[PDB]
Amino acid sequence: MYFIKPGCLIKKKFSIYTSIVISVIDNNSVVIQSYDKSDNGDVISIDREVINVSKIVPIGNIDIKNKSKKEIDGILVEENRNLKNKDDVLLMNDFERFKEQLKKEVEDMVIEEMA
Amino acid sequence: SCRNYSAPRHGSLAYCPKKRAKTTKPAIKSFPKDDASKPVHLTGYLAYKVGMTHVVRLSTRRSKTERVLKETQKEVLDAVTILEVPAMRIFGMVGYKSTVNGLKAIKTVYAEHLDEQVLARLRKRNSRSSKLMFKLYPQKYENGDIKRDYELLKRESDVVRVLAHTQVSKIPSLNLKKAHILEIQLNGGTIEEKIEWAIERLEKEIPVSEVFSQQDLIDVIGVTKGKGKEGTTKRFGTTILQHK
Amino acid sequence: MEVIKKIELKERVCAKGTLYSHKRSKKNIYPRYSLITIENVKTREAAMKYVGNAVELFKPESTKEESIHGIIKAVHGRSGAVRAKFSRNISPVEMGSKVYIKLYKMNEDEI
Amino acid sequence: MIGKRIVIDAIGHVAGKLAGHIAKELMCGIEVVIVHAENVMFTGPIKRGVGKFNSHLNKSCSYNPLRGPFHLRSPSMHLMKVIKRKLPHRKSKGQIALKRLQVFDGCPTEYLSVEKMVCPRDKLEYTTSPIRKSYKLGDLMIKFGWKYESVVEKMNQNEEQFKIEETEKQKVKEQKIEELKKSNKFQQRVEEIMVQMA
Amino acid sequence: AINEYKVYGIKIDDNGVVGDEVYAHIVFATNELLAKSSFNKILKKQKKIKPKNTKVIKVEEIKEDNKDLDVKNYGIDYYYKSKRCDHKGYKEFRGVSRCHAVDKLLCDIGGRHSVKRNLIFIMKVKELTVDEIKKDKIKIFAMEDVEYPAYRNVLRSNKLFVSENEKLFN
Amino acid sequence: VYVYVEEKVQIPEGCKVEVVNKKVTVTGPKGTVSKDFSHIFVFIDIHEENVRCRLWNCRKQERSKLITCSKLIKNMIDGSMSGYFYELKAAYKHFPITFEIKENGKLLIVKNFLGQKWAREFKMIGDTIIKQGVTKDHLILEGISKEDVSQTAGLIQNNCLPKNLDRRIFQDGVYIATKGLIE
RNA sequence: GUUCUGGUAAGCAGGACUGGCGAAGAGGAAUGAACCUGGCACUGUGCUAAGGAACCCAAUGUCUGGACAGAGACCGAAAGAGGUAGGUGAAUAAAAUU
């Protein structure tokens, strides 16, 4: 089991990207640095916020025994670099989606004959 | 206001509503608990009421604490009923399965040769029939359908019962040409043993001496005498009102 | 059989929804308007993108008219349901039925 | 929508909360099958449940008991009556809706293979605090004369057998196909069919 | 939410500025009108100037900085009205602002003593260092010695029905 | 509200303990015992040769349950290294009570209590066995489980008293004399 | 509704002041002459009140404290102990305790 202590990595309710806990206030509230992205044009923003614990899920730990705000922004942009909003099939144009569909569909016709 | 004096109720509510029975022949609806620790045996039978008489028996029953030295013996006069019990004949079997809605019947299997007395129950009016009742069933012996049937009964069943009829032609005073049919349960052993025991005995006659012996305790199920429509004084025992 | 084909044609091209009530208070009903839920639409902001779109109720067992047309007029509540208007008033017997959402806008006069 | 069916595994849900969600679907035309009715959970000690049920048996029609309430004694039928009174059952629309519902203790053989849904908002471990007691409907109903407990235990053992067999049967095909598809003999024909579709 | 304001005002009669004094009052309230109301209340009870002889010259909001959301310890002196009389007391809280501290007291007394927010009066708010802390409650959190795990489960999806074989919580 | 509560019990040299879920099982010289703590809200684990209970942010009446949990675990450990015993003593002013041990020490019969002619029969709970003491008036019970041992002894004591008589004149009975661990 | 006189009181008998029902429909308090919102010719599109928002039944969720009694959401006195949450004032202290 993980613990809620400075340097815990968390996700928020119905969200894909990671955020990090910075201070603990009481037995139910914390201060977090939060990452999010505008799907309108890839515009990111990272900012600090006070939150109740019933909206967050812990997943791991890092150090940050001593760091500045600009440093932790760096930690965060590295951490969630790989992640994405949506599966690309829904983002691409129609012909490209059909081309991707054919691959899967033909592969089944092979497998059902080969098995 | 409360009634002036106390008194008990008239008649028992355990028997209300007191309606007329549907037909004159009873099914045994409840059977004693099975026990796998004992041999295969039958649990019931059919009988006819003849009449009553009386007997004298000797007795020696007294309180265990009674201080009397002598082994006193005493005559007692008692009334008794006589029942006639000719041998029943076995003609088929039924298997049942347990479900969330109780016991349900899986299949029924009949003997190859059946008697005129039992076929007569299947028709309504005795003297007007083409008698084409069971005439096509014997093929099922040749086809192996019987052997497939026993397999299914043996594979999937919780309770097994035999079908037996009574030989009415032996009791002429009944004026009756149709046998009575009863379904009787087998207790003891496992399902396989029960089925083999049954198979050995289709078409044969079982005497009453198989089921009961002297000094045994038994339960008797029957329908009472009929008395027609009647008033409250006789039906529930209420008191007659003031004379004027 | 034309009915079997007309269904498959519609199934391939429309979103699906169900009719569940007339517009009503605790006491009175307003049968000129009906309430619909759409399959995967679950917020009021999501639902706003359908306002103006055509809807069709197809009923093959009917002897008079095989389909009724309508239009989505407004959002209703906070969980993505909508309000619609049809060329004829919907019967209480037709509640629970399947409705097709047609992916193009029409004017209030066309129905 | 009329023409849609749904199968629900009732284990671990709080009875009065699932019943509200189910009743809404029946009014929208769905056919619902509930499985495992004997495992639904009530909150609080069993002691309180026993008293609420005793007060219910006391209710009867004064002049004729064959008109009065019927006190049902099976977990399936009890949960059915909880759902019944969250619908408009005195009117035709509720009587139509009710006939779309079936409820079973255990899982019957015709529903072993079918894939099954669940309701996260109504599960005990979400909707209640850990520090307080609860009981199962199967535990209450043995005290008021239910007679088919053992029949349901025998059913539950058939389910376990089917689960292990199906999972074992699946894991072999997963391994087989995933090991197969890495081969050249497979990856060759991809090209052979595509030559005729490109 | 609660805010902090400072109100200034003078006396007037049939003619202006009848006294050369100006009076001031810091108050925690939700808006300016609730602030002005408090100013009138205190003037009439500590002096005897009724509204028709007063004029407010200024109202200002007071705001902190705290760009990094740093956590601080505060002590608060308060009283409230019950059915019996007026009850005085002192309690300690943690937060990112004086207003954050004050909103937590108001919530606390409503929870513990069944009082509406308008029957509670703040006397003093002070920011404190670790050696100053009097009562037991916050000291462990101040000395930076706390970690704990999660007791509440969290839903994975907004859908009402999900397949048995999916992951349900967190 | 308590911020943190922890309790610890040390596992001796010969003993072995496992935890499956909230069932805790113990093995050692005298045999095996197990108990299920699923009815308590607590977190149990094994760590550095100790058994550890923990809770965070709990109420006053939740921490009482944690502590009670920890004392029961110790009794299981102790009982596995040596079993427990209970000693019973018959007392009478006129009618001598007599005892019979049957079924290898699984059944006790009592005879002649206050001159009554009917017998009484008592059955041993779980692992427990019944044995004869230093003089004819004494019985000893021995077993692994402190629960099973003490419950048995209690049932005998609670039944073998006068009824509808004045207990400060009629003082006859069977009384619990001594209790402890075996050497 | 606010007040008064006679009476142990009363859905009792009798006065004063400002609006009602009588002669007043509609939406809301599950139901109710008089209570809450608010005064009516006949149609169509929008918005709010009072009161609601798991389900019956159109619209529901979130945060922080309390509370375990077949309790409460609907509900009786003088008198009281027990459990638990907080305030204030006295001590003692080789963790604290009274």
TrEMBL record, chain A:
This is Uncharacterized protein.
TrEMBL record, chain C:
Keywords: Ribonucleoprotein, Ribosomal protein. One of its GO terms (cellular component) is ribosome. GO terms for biological process: translation. It comes from the Eukaryota. Pfam families: Ribosomal_L35Ae. GO terms for molecular function: structural constituent of ribosome. Belongs to the eukaryotic ribosomal protein eL33 family. This is 60S ribosomal protein L35a. It comes from Spraguea lophii (strain 42_110) (Microsporidian parasite).
From TrEMBL, chain D:
The keyword Ribonucleoprotein applies. One of its GO terms (biological process) is translation. GO terms for cellular component: cytosolic large ribosomal subunit. GO terms for molecular function: mRNA binding; structural constituent of ribosome. InterPro entries: Ribosomal_uL13, Ribosomal_uL13_euk/arc, Ribosomal_uL13_sf. Keywords: Ribonucleoprotein, Ribosomal protein. Coiled coil: none annotated. The keyword Ribosomal protein applies. Belongs to the universal ribosomal protein uL13 family. This is Ribosomal protein L13A. The lineage of its organism: Eukaryota, Fungi, Fungi incertae sedis, Microsporidia, Spragueidae.
From TrEMBL, chain E:
SUPFAM superfamilies: RplX-like. Keywords: Ribonucleoprotein, Ribosomal protein. Transmembrane segments: none annotated. The keyword Ribosomal protein applies. GO terms for cellular component: ribonucleoprotein complex; ribosome. GO terms for molecular function: structural constituent of ribosome. The keyword Transmembrane does not apply. GO terms for biological process: translation. Coiled coil: none annotated. Residues 4-126 form the Large ribosomal subunit protein eL20 domain. Belongs to the eukaryotic ribosomal protein eL20 family. PANTHER family: 60S RIBOSOMAL PROTEIN L18A. This is 60S ribosomal protein L20. It comes from Spraguea lophii (strain 42_110) (Microsporidian parasite).
